[PDB]
């Protein structure tokens, strides 16, 4: 990320049949899969690089990423059930308490006597 958070994402998608399709199956040639896979990898790379971890998680909740993928891959091959399957956190920067407080939006004791 832009925060020096090294993370790994898993994106999963499925092929679908068009409205008027008659063939039982909807298999995609490997040329489409590698083309689609290249586009999905680009989009994930673009978003995470151009975002913070706090911003990134704000993307996950509304699943705007899944909608971006669908539009990008719409020309190559129609798809369905596109999701970000998983997000792994490999490495973390030096802990910055100042940031942690800001993400969450000091206090005095009571004289004990």
């Amino acid at each position: 990320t832009s925060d020096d958070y090294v993370l790994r994402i898993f994106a999963i998608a499925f092929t679908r049949k068009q409205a008027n399709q008659v063939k039982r199956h909807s298999y995609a040639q490997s040329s489409h899969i590698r083309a689609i896979r290249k586009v999905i990898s680009e989009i994930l790379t673009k978003e995470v690089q151009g975002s913070t971890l706090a911003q990134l998680t704000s993307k996950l909740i509304p699943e705007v990423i899944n909608k971006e993928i669908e539009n990008a891959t719409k020309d190559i091959f129609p798809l369905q059930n596109i999701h970000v399957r998983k997000v792994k956190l490999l490495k973390q920067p030096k802990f910055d308490v100042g940031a942690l407080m800001a993400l969450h939006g000091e206090e005095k004791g009571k004289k004990v006597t």
């Binding site: 832009s2 993307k59 509304p62 705007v64 910055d96 939006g105 004791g109 009571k110 004990v112």
Partner: protein, 1077 residues
């Protein structure tokens, strides 16, 4: 590396002393050496007899305090011929040209027979030394008269390394034997012979002053005086063994001087004790080992850079004071011991001396950070660091070198108060030879304990201390001192820790059934201020509580209390410089504003929370396209808005925080630019319409925007949050970018530069802006003081009518330079320190020949690499090639977010750029001439206003200072949103609209923030002008003149200054009041 080697050689030759001046001096001292041998011997004398002998002479024996009394001076005195010798740098031929001047050390070995084996007790030897110095001075004086050299040589006493126990005679030449042009001064050291006193009895732990407590300083004074030639012989051997010694020695001397270090004593309070000699010895210790396994850390084959780096690396990492020390042998391999003596130590087991006694712990600690600081710089590969390491002075201003400075005026300062003086006592006299040495330690301990973790580095300096006195006086005389105390006042300088500096409790030891030693001292130290408290964690610990103020830091309160309780109850602690700067920062009209510390950003957090509530609403609203992302890009989101956001204060310019709205990619957008704009509005209509129905509590209205030239259809939605905040909405479309590029392509060649400027503003506002606010928001968390200093900096620009042209973005990128690139200084830790550094940089920054490129990264990935760096460097050279004078572009500010560098600095007229440089130069010059005091700083923040050709005085109907949330106040938004204008200040738009009309002829400037810089009521603002040189003079009449003129002849016209006065007067309507020309 090769560039570094050539740079080093270029430095060495530049500082290389001119050999002719060497010969001029050797010609003298050799002749002087004949004079010394002329000096006649003397017989045994008692203190009464010598007192009579010197009773009427002009010379006065400079006895060391306490002066010998008749009872204890039963031992006699005598003078014999010495063994003259030359020591110091000049012996090793490692001196360099110093504009201030250098010193030639000549050691005079008193013959051994003038001593008893037990002369190292109770100042016995120091007395014998003092008279022997006195006898030489008198006889040298008359012999100097005999040879008629007395005409141009001035004789005075002084202290060696500011050691009060070691007065010396100094020879200097005022304007054939005249060596004034050489800029050298001869110093006559009266040292003892080697091994006169058992060095075991002179070890630091032992004592030599009967009163038992140890006497490290007095032990060091005698023992070192007996070991001078030995260290010359030791250093002399190494210079033979390694060919790279001398140029290694000069470099360190250069480095040390820039950081305000020296071999002068530090216990008195001045920073020093690490000089060339110690830097020279420390190599010779390393050249014979250095590691824990006694293995060699520096090889004789090492070059200059390699020897230097090893020592810097050695100091930076291995510790010599708290845990571990280095012992070596002059006459056996050097080895690093784990055990530490809790003081900066470097034994010489051969001689049983500690070379670092003169080093203070506070000074030693700072020396490491500089050592650690450069070692990072030295390992840097991306940027050249030679100019910063060696050719930059940080010690010119203490304030730039220290975050906070306090001056404590002690009481009764012709002799110090009896109460405080009684604290000196006999015991501490034995431990600490002088009161100044003692009192500096008293201040630092209590200052160190009280501030605790709030500070990193502390220095206590005895301001106005002298070290040289005329031959007719026995000790130094200060006008305040009256021979009692060689100082005027004490200044406390601190390197603060921004993380915990503003901590509102000073935590302490945790409670226990039986009061522990650590607990006891805490309760004694703070006394009544000490309290035993519990927290909501459930912990019970002793802690004392303070109060923040928006005027001064918690540290000011602590030190003020801390000193008065223990040092002296009459002390007066003051820092008016820091206080005034804090005041200049606008004070928000929020609850409990006065008690808020400037490091508090809570006002911004409330705005972000206010955004978040609206952020949820937009997403769940249904639209033809899903909302891809809503990105805040407003000033207040990055902690850089000038005045903290205040609810409902809608007169402030930065009230409406922009937000970027991006929809999902679609192919159905209009292909034409205007249709794209009107498509974007149509959503803001739907967003506005739906928002009104579902959440009627919010309010909305529309406003046009004209920042982007020629894109006149852009419309924005303003949302007024019930919490009391405003937001502006603008839509970003993927097709939007490529439509501009299409515009540049199809434009005629003459017009391509103009359209490029339009695209440049766009990428600045939509595309680059998102990256900026992200990077600046995150990085601010590690640099706490960034938000204040940049705001106060923006304030300073506004008072002088610069924020009108300097785009706000350029203000941040310049202001962040001291933080990301603190070298050679430290990271700013206080408001005075940060702001000046921004001014120091601009003053010395040569924007025609040097680009500014910043690594917007947190303190030590995302650093610039070699390839990226060489890429940006090439951009500047390509740019300057077409624009050598820098007319079209002045400031090159680039980073990853903008490798181009022209995005945030295009369009600034050259006159404005020079002013920001000219004013910066004037400001720093003023500080050098007049120190930082209340008067100087007021000048910094008042505008000259006289250079502008004509000045128009402008006034608003109503005072806005309350409506800007500025506490010297509205509580709801007006019902009819048209009324918003009636509490606004349109001058900023007046100037912007004027400049376009008179771009070729006039450059007008106005105060954007009227509430802050508009007087008490925040309603006084000024429009200042300038006439370009071409139109200042008459010009032949032509159609393309394109400026408002008046005729003089058939084909001659002149600028119609009087007409322009009306057109300015027309815009303001009632607002314009008075004109000056």
């Amino acid at each position: 590396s090769n560039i570094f080697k050539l740079q080093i050689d270029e430095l060495l030759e530049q500082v290389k002393l001119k050999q002719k001046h060497v010969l001029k001096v050797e010609k003298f001292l050799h002749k002087l050496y004949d004079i010394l041998q002329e000096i006649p011997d003397w017989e045994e004398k008692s203190l009464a007899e010598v007192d009579s002998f010197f009773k009427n002479k002009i010379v006065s024996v400079p006895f060391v305090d306490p002066k010998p009394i008749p009872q204890n001076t039963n031992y006699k005195f005598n003078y014999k011929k010495p063994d003259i010798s030359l020591i110091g740098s000049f012996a090793l031929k490692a001196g360099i040209y110093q504009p201030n001047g250098s010193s030639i050390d000549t050691l005079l070995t008193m013959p051994k027979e003038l001593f008893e084996k037990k002369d190292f007790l109770n100042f016995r030897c120091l007395h014998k030394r003092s008279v022997y110095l006195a006898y030489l001075t008198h006889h040298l004086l008359i012999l100097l008269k005999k040879d008629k050299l007395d005409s141009f040589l001035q004789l005075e006493y002084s202290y060696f390394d500011n050691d009060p126990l070691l007065p010396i005679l100094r020879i200097s030449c005022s304007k054939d034997y005249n060596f004034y042009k050489t800029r050298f001064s001869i110093n006559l050291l009266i040292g003892f012979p080697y091994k006169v006193f058992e060095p075991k009895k002179l070890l630091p732990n032992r004592n030599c002053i009967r009163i038992l407590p140890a006497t490290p300083l007095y032990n060091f004074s005698v023992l070192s005086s007996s070991t001078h030639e030995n260290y010359l012989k030791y250093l002399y051997k190494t210079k033979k063994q390694t060919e790279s010694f001398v140029e290694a020695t000069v470099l360190g001397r250069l480095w040390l001087q820039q950081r305000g270090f020296s071999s002068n004593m530090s216990h008195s309070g001045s920073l020093g004790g690490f000089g060339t000699f110690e830097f020279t010895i420390l190599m010779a210790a390393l050249l014979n080992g250095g590691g824990i396994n006694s293995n060699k850390i520096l090889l004789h084959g090492f070059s200059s850079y390699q020897l230097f780096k090893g020592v810097i690396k050695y100091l930076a990492t291995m510790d010599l004071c708290h845990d571990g020390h280095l012992q070596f042998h002059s006459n056996p391999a050097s080895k690093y011991i784990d055990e530490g003596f809790q003081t900066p130590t470097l034994f010489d087991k051969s001689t049983k001396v500690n070379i670092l006694t003169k080093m203070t712990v506070s000074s030693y600690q700072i020396l490491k950070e500089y050592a650690g600081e450069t070692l990072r710089m030295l390992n840097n590969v991306v940027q050249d660091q030679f100019s910063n390491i060696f050719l930059t002075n940080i010690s010119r201003f203490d304030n730039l070198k220290y975050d906070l400075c306090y001056d404590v005026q002690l009481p009764l300062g012709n002799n110090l108060e009896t109460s405080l003086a009684a604290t000196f006592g006999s015991m501490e006299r034995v431990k600490f030879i002088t009161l100044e040495n003692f009192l500096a330690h008293k201040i630092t301990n209590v200052a160190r304990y009280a501030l605790g973790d709030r500070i990193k580095y502390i220095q206590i300096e005895m301001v106005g201390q002298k070290s040289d006195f005329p031959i007719t006086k026995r000790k130094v005389y200060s006008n305040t001192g009256g021979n009692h105390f060689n100082f005027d006042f004490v200044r406390v300088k601190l390197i603060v820790n921004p993380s915990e500096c503003d901590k509102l409790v000073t935590k302490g030891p945790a409670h226990s059934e039986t009061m522990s030693t650590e607990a006891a001292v805490f309760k004694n130290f703070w006394g009544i201020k000490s309290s035993l408290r519990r927290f909501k964690d459930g912990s019970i610990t002793h802690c004392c509580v303070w109060s923040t103020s928006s005027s001064e830091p918690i540290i000011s309160s602590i030190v003020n209390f801390a000193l008065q309780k223990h040092v002296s109850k009459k002390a007066q602690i003051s820092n008016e410089t820091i206080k005034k700067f804090h005041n200049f920062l606008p004070l928000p009209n929020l609850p409990s504003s006065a008690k808020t510390s400037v490091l508090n950003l809570s006002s911004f957090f409330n705005l972000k929370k206010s955004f978040d509530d609206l952020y949820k609403i937009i997403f769940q609203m249904k639209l033809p396209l899903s909302v891809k992302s809503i990105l805040p890009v407003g000033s207040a989101f990055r902690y850089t808005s000038l005045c903290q956001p205040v609810p409902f204060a809608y007169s402030d310019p930065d009230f409406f925080q922009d937000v970027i709205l991006e929809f999902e990619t679609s192919p159905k957008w209009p292909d034409e630019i205007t249709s794209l704009e009107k498509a974007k509005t149509a959503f803001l209509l739907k967003i506005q319409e739906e928002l009104s129905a579902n959440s009627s509590t919010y309010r909305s209205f529309f406003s046009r925007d004209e920042s982007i030239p020629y894109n006149l259809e852009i419309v924005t939605l303003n949302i007024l949050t019930p919490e009391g905040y405003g937001f502006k909405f603008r839509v970003l479309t993927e097709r939007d970018e490529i439509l501009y590029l299409r515009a540049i392509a199809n434009a005629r060649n003459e017009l391509k530069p103009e359209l490029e400027a339009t695209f440049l503003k766009f990428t600045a506002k939509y595309l680059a802006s998102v990256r900026h606010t992200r990077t600046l928001e995150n990085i601010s968390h590690s640099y706490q003081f960034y938000s204040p200093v940049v705001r106060l900096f923006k304030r300073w620009l506004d008072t002088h009518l610069l924020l009108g042209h300097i785009t706000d973005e350029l203000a941040e990128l310049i202001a962040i330079k001291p933080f990301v690139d603190p070298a050679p200084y430290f990271i700013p830790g206080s408001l005075e320190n940060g702001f000046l550094k921004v001014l120091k940089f601009i003053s010395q920054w040569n924007w025609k020949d040097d680009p500014l490129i910043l690594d917007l990264v947190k303190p030590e990935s995302e650093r610039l690499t070699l390839a990226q760096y060489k890429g940006i460097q090439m951009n500047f050279t390509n740019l300057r090639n077409s624009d050598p004078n820098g007319t079209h572009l002045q400031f090159f500010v680039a980073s990853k977010n903008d490798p181009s560098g022209i995005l945030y600095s295009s369009g600034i007229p050259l006159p404005i750029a020079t002013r920001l440089t000219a004013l910066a130069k004037v400001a720093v010059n003023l500080l050098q001439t007049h120190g930082l005091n209340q008067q100087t700083i007021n000048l910094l923040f008042t505008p000259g206003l006289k250079d502008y050709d004509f000045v128009v005085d402008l006034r608003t109907p109503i005072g806005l200072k309350s409506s800007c949330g500025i506490l010297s106040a509205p509580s709801n938004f007006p019902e009819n949103l048209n009324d918003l204008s009636e509490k606004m200040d349109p001058t900023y738009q007046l100037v912007k609209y004027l400049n376009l009309k008179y771009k070729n002829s006039l450059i007008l400037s106005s105060r954007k923030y009227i509430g802050v810089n508009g007087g008490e009521k925040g309603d006084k603002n000024v429009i200042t002008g300038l006439i370009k040189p071409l139109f200042k003079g008459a010009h032949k009449f032509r159609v393309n003149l394109d400026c408002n003129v008046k005729p003089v002849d058939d084909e001659n016209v002149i600028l119609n200054k009087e007409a322009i006065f009306h057109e300015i007067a027309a815009f303001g309507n009632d607002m314009v009041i008075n004109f000056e020309t």
